[PDB]
Ligand binder design. Structure first.
Ligand SMILES: *[C@@H](C)[C@H]1/C(=C/c2[nH]c(/C=C3N=C(/C=C4\NC(=O)C(CC)=C4C)C(C)=C\3CCC(=O)O)c(CCC(=O)O)c2C)NC(=O)[C@@H]1C
Ligand SMILES: *[C@@H](C)[C@H]1/C(=C/c2[nH]c(/C=C3N=C(/C=C4\NC(=O)C(CC)=C4C)C(C)=C\3CCC(=O)O)c(CCC(=O)O)c2C)NC(=O)[C@@H]1C
Ligand SMILES: *[C@H](C)[C@H]1/C(=C/c2[nH]c(/C=C3N=C(/C=C4\NC(=O)C(CC)=C4C)C(C)=C\3CCC(=O)O)c(CCC(=O)O)c2C)NC(=O)[C@@H]1C
Ligand SMILES: *[C@H](C)[C@H]1/C(=C/c2[nH]c(/C=C3N=C(/C=C4\NC(=O)C(CC)=C4C)C(C)=C\3CCC(=O)O)c(CCC(=O)O)c2C)NC(=O)[C@@H]1C
Ligand SMILES: *[C@H](C)[C@H]1/C(=C/c2[nH]c(/C=C3N=C(/C=C4\NC(=O)C(CC)=C4C)C(C)=C\3CCC(=O)O)c(CCC(=O)O)c2C)NC(=O)[C@@H]1C
Ligand SMILES: *[C@H](C)[C@H]1/C(=C/c2[nH]c(/C=C3N=C(/C=C4\NC(=O)C(CC)=C4C)C(C)=C\3CCC(=O)O)c(CCC(=O)O)c2C)NC(=O)[C@@H]1C
Ligand SMILES: *[C@H](C)[C@H]1/C(=C/c2[nH]c(/C=C3N=C(/C=C4\NC(=O)C(CC)=C4C)C(C)=C\3CCC(=O)O)c(CCC(=O)O)c2C)NC(=O)[C@@H]1C
Ligand SMILES: *[C@H](C)[C@H]1/C(=C/c2[nH]c(/C=C3N=C(/C=C4\NC(=O)C(CC)=C4C)C(C)=C\3CCC(=O)O)c(CCC(=O)O)c2C)NC(=O)[C@@H]1C
Ligand SMILES: *[C@H](C)[C@H]1/C(=C/c2[nH]c(/C=C3N=C(/C=C4\NC(=O)C(CC)=C4C)C(C)=C\3CCC(=O)O)c(CCC(=O)O)c2C)NC(=O)[C@@H]1C
Ligand SMILES: *[C@H](C)[C@H]1/C(=C/c2[nH]c(/C=C3N=C(/C=C4\NC(=O)C(CC)=C4C)C(C)=C\3CCC(=O)O)c(CCC(=O)O)c2C)NC(=O)[C@@H]1C
Lengths: 67, 161, 160, 348, 50, 161, 160, 161, 161, 160
């Protein structure tokens, strides 16, 4: 299936976490196409800034065979 | 994943038309080649581990790559390279069955050249390993089937190189 | 396609292709000649199937062609016939693929809320595909009409 | 003897007192030397099953008498009349909203459920829609999210399960180690995290051919999150064959919730939500809905392996009500023993 | 205490009442004994296991 | 769960022996009955929603169940009952394809009686609904397939009762 | 079997059977007679394949029956042939079922841990199964052996 | 319980109409089959020990069930299995002469699954015993009466499975 | 990461030899320095918060950052900066005990510069804060371990800037 | 090293170095003289332990040196002793560094699929390292044998 290569930064707003939080603060990721809407909405209601997003796999305008 | 059949369907859908004779001829060619594809896939699955072991034994073992100071010295790196070669064999078998290398472009050739350049993986040594796998499979599954397997094999070799 | 589904199942399980699906690929690759015979029959006779099916749908459920209905007027009935042409084209794509994944990736996902937005009764769309199936099965050969009608009534079941 | 079931809590109480005082002969004598036995069967008539049509059936022991008049009554070993008569007066029990059988055993691995047919012990109770089940938090009792909803992300130090995170750096994250680096220390940490995530999804360790090596090397390269790795492990066909297909649908939903959130479902709201997801779209959709739920994101980040956060009271009773691991001050008066005052005076 | 109309106990598959009269013949005496065994033991144990 | 073939295989494996003649006869019987099962599954998958529609209109519409105070009064109760009918019809189709009612024990009837007893669901009304499902299914699917579907839906009714 | 696998997949996607899987069940139903013939020949000759493949295994790997080996001894060689008979019976079950899930459930899940606890070389057991497929291919007709060797192939892929 | 006549009259009473067009056909088919069904009942009741004898001899004897470690090892368990097969034959006769399986639903299948799962009785071996029952009755009474008994015996088999 | 001992093991593994004389002299040198490293690490761990407070007092207090409009104004941002200085001091203690800065290479400086550029953190101000940390630690532990502490802290400076 | 393991544990617990593990590092530094003298004795006497441990392994399990085995032949025996000398070098690295994690990451991760591909008996390799433990305990003093036996038994437990 077609995948999204995304990169975003999410800050902490409620607590000062005393453990190492850089890896889940800033990350580059591979999310699926059907889960990308809910993942983006989750991090974006969380309040992060997404810096980059591309189609890692697949091609635009694919009528069939994208899975 | 794009195969010959889905390529025919998508090439029909981009103009919205039905299937003409021009799209019919390549589909008939795929239907003619599919029996040889299934036979070659059965032989490759029958000897999947032994091809990898024999090509590793006569291609890179007891050399400077597996010597200390080489990339393939450590047992972790050795198991990683064995997993990589098994993945290349299995996904090239997938491409041989599907009739297209889009599975290689979408699953294997997605951010691997930069990963190998970052990790210092020897491109020439992987080329030699791919050629050893290709010639062992060409010796094992047959002449025409081995050459058709080697089409996807040197396509993914040129993609990774 | 069937080969595409077998490839993605083998890749998801991280293994080579199973004996059963290899035999399925072999039998499909032998029966592709009969599948393309069904395909060329449907593409040659595509217009009379959709015309008779649209007429039978219109006489069966006249609330579509009635004023206030979803297709009031000749251009909207022509749009409905164009949608039936699209569904017949997707059925031909299904019978050449050997699997229903082209109909999923073009004309099945989101079709319920699609026709909810359009106001089109998807049960009447299912009735139209039933009329297309029965006119096509009456037209072409029965042993091949069973193979065509399997994909036809999968489309009917997903419509309903 | 009487051809009917027990009729009231006081009747069960009286005849239990009789059979405790004098045993089976006293119980039999008290049954036959009764006004009801002499009224119904007299002296010469064989007793008969006074079912639905023989007489007027009272509206209090209906299902219990219906199960008792079946021939499979001597295979229900759990007493059904006294339990229902007590639970009639008492409020709703600690039980899953779809029945007592829907509650798995709170063990390390294995979706072990009570079976309706094998040794019947079904205990229905009318749970309505908005009926939250009281759950016992593994960590601090203050950090229960019922009264402290901002403590969902708090870690249970020394009170609950061990928390596995990607706090350590994954190997090959940067090119600061410009090749070589044969004693790179951090890879056992992420391998341990992978094994712990595998254990959490499938409670016991897998075999050699079952591991998702593509997902493992994707997490080791950093392409996917711990959240995505847990999603792929639960979406794997092994989870389908092990815990979804061989079980009843709501049982599998409950076990999936306990594995993927460390928590039993609160009740009919979450149960009906995941049941509707299972009916409309399916098992993969249930998995991704449970992972993409807001409570999952609050409890665990993108780097945290799920852990057992809440228990049922019955499960906590199984864990901490045995002979070992039960404290001296749980349900017992503790007398402060002391050296006696005469011994203290006798000590020079 | 309860009440039941005399139409419900006219269609609902009445129980066969077995009463041991002292003068009864062998067939109905054994029928009453077997019915008593079925009542006490939920089955015919003297037929199944003697 | 298991089908007839896997039931024969599991029985022979528990016995520890190979497939004898009676096992081959039972397998030949299932292979004889397979085509009707496949076409019946195609018919039911075609008419999945409509069988439920005419069954609930045959048994439960304009009755005390859908009247106020009944257990199908509200829209969520109607949706849950339609969901239950879809579950019963799909799992009966699965049992018809397998030739065995083991999937009904594993997936459906393992705790559904206690579930309905806790929910307050009238199992008499569900039994009449599944009888209507039997009648509408046997109207559309034929005679022998109607017998098989009736056997498995009566198994569902017996598990409920 | 393939029917159980298709039902499990359809339940996983919460849908009825796709017509591709209906076609695969139909084709398995029509072609099961050849599988029954293969299984009948194997259970008729089941001592002969074990006999010849055990002989060929003791020729090619005499370290197995050498002292210090896993199968050194009369009872140990008896248990070796017992394992060969087990895998032959499993191959007959897989040929009958048309799908390799009974073989996977009975004798391919945890086989690595089992033979690791027993100290048995898994590649040598794979060599024994490969020699069993050689003897069975010699015993059967060409197309039947080509179809029946794929279950042996899955056993080889899982064990080696 | 109910029979075919009660089912017909209940369906017509739920409709509120008379026995119009197909209820009469079902009743006349029932009364046409009835005298031969009574004759088959006479034969089965007369020979009833022989059917369970040949069934246990055909299916369950000389097996792991009868050898030590099995569920038919002790004499009490053997006599209980004989009584269970007598129960199955007698209630199959009851359902065969009633024309409906409601007697099997309310007096056999209501608790058979739970008593066998609690006891540990092998479901597959019980199914094989009932299959031996149905072929022995088909041999001893006839093909048509054998099938008329065997549909209810297969209903009991489906209730087991 | 790698310390001095595992760096010696790395140098042994690249050449594929045992431990020669120079490597053992390096290990004895590390064993000699380990006493001062442990004592300095104990001093920093005992005085962790005070170093941060004197550094932020001599560097960042009464400035445009802690005035409104700066990046210190919110007390959440103040606690974040104090936690960042705690992180830098703790990883500096880790590198001082290890004898190598590979811990800072792999964990802290993996994305710190770009995430500070994304969040608007002033790199010059935190560089001066790290310099203040270095001066406070050099005053606290003396020049002896303070030279290695300054080496690791201005390695953090060079990596961040 | 245990200093790196302590850094990793303190970073995982998000804290500084505990006084107990700092005193552990102190004891490591003080005992480092004996901890390196054991490494120098093993390096100096590294040949004869390999040779007679290999001979004891070969007479204990002669199947691997028997024809048809993995280690049969001059070249295979030579590379078997080469792997034994490599693992002796890993044991020397572990007993100088004080921690078993460098051994676990340089030679002992992936060793199962390594020797599964190679056909090497992992139980025979564990027996070889066991005989190396016996030879080293014979060649060194009792307390030094006890402190080397922890690393040796770590290798044994991770092998099997
Ligand atoms: C000599 C003793 C008489 C003889 C014996 C005979 N017995 C059978 C068959 C069976 N007998 C049993 C009995 C038991 N099995 C148990 O476990 C126990 C309790 C310990 C008992 C009492 C069984 C089970 C069988 C069936 C065989 C089986 O294991 O399945 C036969 C065979 C009859 C047939 O029709 O097969 C015979 C011949 N017969 C005589 O006349 C001698 C007096
Ligand atoms: C051969 C049939 C298999 C076998 C059977 C077996 N059954 C029992 C005991 C019982 N069977 C029942 C079932 C019923 N009682 C009823 O009244 C009715 C409907 C009319 C049924 C279906 C019951 C209740 C019992 C227990 C008490 C009794 O004997 O009635 C046993 C004995 C279990 C024990 O351990 O004592 C056995 C062994 N077992 C097999 O293996 C054959 C496949
Ligand atoms: C083998 C022919 C030669 C070679 C290989 C080698 N590979 C690795 C490690 C990795 N390679 C990948 C890449 C992939 N991910 C995928 O999903 C696929 C198939 C589609 C591939 C090919 C990954 C993720 C790894 C693991 C990265 C990691 O180190 O964690 C290594 C190890 C590198 C290391 O530093 O350990 C090696 C050595 N190099 C050779 O010399 C062989 C000749
Ligand atoms: C009348 C308002 C509605 C109605 C009634 C109806 N009830 C029955 C049968 C039963 N009713 C009961 C209930 C009770 N038993 C008790 O002991 C008590 C409290 C003292 C109650 C409330 C029971 C147990 C039965 C079953 C046997 C019996 O009559 O005791 C029926 C008969 C059903 C049949 O046909 O068998 C009916 C019709 N039905 C309606 O439609 C009205 C809304
Ligand atoms: C071995 C001594 C005997 C035996 C074992 C056996 N066990 C299983 C499977 C399971 N065992 C458990 C038990 C546990 N759950 C826990 O939480 C713990 C402690 C942490 C234990 C010990 C469970 C849950 C299972 C189910 C599978 C799973 O792993 O989740 C089996 C398999 C049974 C099956 O049908 O799969 C067996 C055979 N049986 C014997 O005969 C040996 C004497
Ligand atoms: C105080 C009056 C007495 C007392 C109390 C006590 N309670 C607990 C712990 C728990 N209490 C609950 C109860 C609820 N959870 C809910 O959601 C609701 C309704 C909103 C209630 C009433 C639970 C679940 C716990 C478990 C901890 C948790 O929060 O999950 C304890 C602690 C037991 C322990 O061993 O730690 C105590 C001591 N005990 C007394 O002696 C006071 C008289
Ligand atoms: C009228 C505005 C439109 C219309 C209506 C229509 N509805 C039905 C049938 C039913 N509708 C319901 C819905 C509800 N029942 C409730 O109790 C509530 C909430 C209080 C709702 C929303 C139900 C249950 C039925 C089934 C009938 C029954 O009560 O048993 C029909 C009949 C369809 C049939 O097949 O009989 C119709 C025609 N249709 C339109 O086109 C108007 C837009
Ligand atoms: C429809 C025939 C009749 C009926 C149905 C009805 N059911 C519910 C609610 C539930 N039913 C289930 C049952 C299942 N669990 C499973 O795992 C499966 C498939 C194997 C089934 C079928 C469950 C779990 C529920 C609860 C869902 C929820 O919590 O909402 C209702 C809703 C009652 C309510 O919401 O209070 C209804 C109405 N009842 C009737 O009257 C119809 C005749
Ligand atoms: C203090 C020296 C200067 C500064 C501070 C400041 N920090 C933040 C927030 C974050 N800091 C980090 C850094 C790390 N996380 C890690 O895990 C590690 C390694 C262990 C480091 C170094 C991160 C990730 C954040 C983001 C939020 C979080 O807590 O995860 C802020 C911004 C707070 C906000 O977003 O509102 C600031 C301002 N700025 C200065 O001016 C001081 C000189
Ligand atoms: C001897 C105890 C057993 C044995 C040995 C054996 N080894 C090989 C060949 C290789 N073994 C390795 C593995 C390693 N890589 C490493 O970095 C280390 C030390 C950390 C080890 C142990 C490798 C890479 C090879 C190949 C050599 C090369 O450099 O290419 C063989 C040969 C296998 C073959 O097919 O030729 C053998 C036989 N076999 C036994 O039976 C003894 C139990």
């Amino acid at each position: 299936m077609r995948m999204f290569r995304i990169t975003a930064c999410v800050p902490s707003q409620t607590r000062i976490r005393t453990q190492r939080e850089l890896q889940n603060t800033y990350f580059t990721k591979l999310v699926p196409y059907d889960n990308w809407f809910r993942e983006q909405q989750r991090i974006m209601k969380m309040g992060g800034k997404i810096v980059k997003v591309e189609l890692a796999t697949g091609r635009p305008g694919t009528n069939a065979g994208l899975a | 994943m794009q195969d010959a059949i889905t390529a025919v369907i998508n090439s029909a859908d981009v103009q919205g038309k039905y299937l003409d004779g021009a799209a019919m001829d390549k589909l008939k060619s795929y239907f003619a080649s599919g029996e040889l594809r299934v036979r070659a896939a059965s032989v490759i699955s029958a000897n999947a581990a032994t091809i990898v072991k024999e090509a590793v034994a006569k291609s890179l073992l007891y050399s400077d790559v597996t010597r200390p100071g080489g990339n393939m010295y450590t047992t972790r790196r050795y198991a990683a390279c064995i997993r990589d070669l098994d993945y290349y064999l299995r996904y090239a078998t997938y491409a041989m069955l599907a009739g297209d290398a889009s599975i290689l472009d979408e699953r294997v050739l997605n951010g691997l050249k930069e990963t190998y350049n970052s990790l210092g993986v020897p491109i020439s040594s992987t080329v030699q390993a791919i050629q050893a796998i290709k010639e062992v499979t060409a010796s094992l599954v047959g002449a025409d089937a081995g050459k058709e397997m080697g089409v996807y094999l040197d396509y993914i070799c040129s993609g990774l190189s | 396609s069937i080969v595409t589904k077998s490839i993605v199942n083998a890749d998801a399980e991280a293994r080579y292709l199973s004996p059963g699906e290899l035999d399925r690929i072999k039998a499909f690759v032998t029966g592709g000649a009969a599948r393309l015979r069904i395909a060329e029959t449907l593409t040659g006779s595509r217009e009379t199937i959709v015309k008779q099916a649209g007429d039978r749908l219109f006489q069966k459920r006249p609330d579509i062609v009635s004023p206030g209905g979803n297709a009031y007027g000749e251009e909207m009935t022509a749009t409905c016939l164009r949608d039936m042409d699209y569904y017949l084209r997707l059925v031909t794509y299904g019978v050449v693929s050997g699997d229903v994944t082209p109909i999923e990736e073009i004309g099945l996902v989101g079709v319920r809320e699609m026709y909810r937005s359009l106001g089109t009764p998807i049960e009447a769309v299912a009735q139209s595909v039933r009329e297309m199936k029965e006119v096509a099965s009456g037209l072409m050969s029965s042993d091949d009409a069973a193979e065509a009608s399997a994909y036809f009534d999968f489309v009917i079941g997903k419509m309903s | 003897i009487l051809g009917r079931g027990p009729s009231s809590r006081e009747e069960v109480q009286k005849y239990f007192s009789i059979v405790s005082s004098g045993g089976l002969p006293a119980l039999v004598d008290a049954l036959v030397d009764s006004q009801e036995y002499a009224d119904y069967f007299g002296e010469e008539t064989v007793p008969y099953l006074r079912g639905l049509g023989v007489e007027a059936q009272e509206c209090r022991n209906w299902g219990m008498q219906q199960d008792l008049f079946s021939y499979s009554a001597p295979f229900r070993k759990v007493p059904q009349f006294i339990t229902t008569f007590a639970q009639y007066d008492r409020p709703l029990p600690d039980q899953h909203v779809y029945g007592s059988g829907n509650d798995p055993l709170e063990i390390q691995f294995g979706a072990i459920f009570p079976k309706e047919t094998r040794n019947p012990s079904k205990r229905p109770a009318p749970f309505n829609k908005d009926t939250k089940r009281i759950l016992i938090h593994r960590g601090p009792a203050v950090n229960n999210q019922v009264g402290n909803p901002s403590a969902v992300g708090e870690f249970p130090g020394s009170l609950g399960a061990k928390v596995f995170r990607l706090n350590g750096g994954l190997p090959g994250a940067k090119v600061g180690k410009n090749t070589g680096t044969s004693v790179k220390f951090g890879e056992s940490s992420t391998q341990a995290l992978i094994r712990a995530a595998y254990r959490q999804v499938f409670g016991r360790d897998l075999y050699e051919g079952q591991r998702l090596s593509v997902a493992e090397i994707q997490l080791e390269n950093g392409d996917i999150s711990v959240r995505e790795f847990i999603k792929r492990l639960a979406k794997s066909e092994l989870f389908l064959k092990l815990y979804w297909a061989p079980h009843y649908v709501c049982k599998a939903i409950e076990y999936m919730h306990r594995r993927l959130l460390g928590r039993p479902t609160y009740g009919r709201q979450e149960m009906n939500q995941y049941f509707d997801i299972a009916s409309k779209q399916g098992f993969y959709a249930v998995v991704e809905a449970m992972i993409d739920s807001k409570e999952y994101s609050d409890a665990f980040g993108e780097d945290t392996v799920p852990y057992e956060r809440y228990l049922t009271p019955g499960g906590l009773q199984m864990r901490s009500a045995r002979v070992g691991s039960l404290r001296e001050d749980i349900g017992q008066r503790v007398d402060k023993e002391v050296t006696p005052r005469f011994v203290e005076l006798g000590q020079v | 205490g309860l009440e039941l109309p005399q139409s419900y106990f006219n269609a609902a598959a009445k129980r066969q009442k077995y009463a041991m009269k002292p003068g009864l013949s062998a067939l109905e005496k054994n029928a009453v004994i077997k019915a008593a065994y079925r009542q006490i033991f939920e089955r015919d144990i003297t037929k199944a296991y003697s």
